[PDB]
Amino acid sequence: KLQDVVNQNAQALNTLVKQLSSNFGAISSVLNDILSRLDPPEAEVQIDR
Amino acid sequence: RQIAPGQTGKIADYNYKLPDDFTGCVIAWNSNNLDNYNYLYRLF
Numbered sequence: 001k002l003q004d005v006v007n008q009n010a011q012a013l014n015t016l017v018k019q020l021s022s023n024f025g026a027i028s029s030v031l032n033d034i035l036s037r038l039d040p041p042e043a044e045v046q047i048d049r
Numbered sequence: 050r051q052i053a054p055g056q057t058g059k060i061a062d063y064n065y066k067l068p069d070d071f072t073g074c075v076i077a078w079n080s081n082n083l084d085n086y087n088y089l090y091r092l093f
Contacts, residue, residue, distance in 0.1 A: 039055075039057065039063060040069065041055030041069045042055060044069075
């Protein structure tokens with residue numbers, strides 16, 4: 001039970017951090033790319049995604 | 050085509066720019082029938 005509770009907290013945080021690598025349909029998952037590759041009026045649509 | 054939010058070009062960059070959330074209209078017509086190198090714009 002205790003090792004399971006520690007594992008669930010680990011899997012939740014590990015999933016939550018892994019989500020930062022995902023696109024969600026943006027042009028890059030790296031926020032600093034979107035903010036440098038594209039002009040703000042274009043970029044904001046990808047950032048809002 | 051430069052006279053809109055989210056555009057780029059010499060006018061839209063260096064001379065006259067509309068806010069990204071501009072709230073109104075743009076109206077145009079050709080002026081050749083009235084206009085002569087007297088009209089100037091910015092390049093630097």
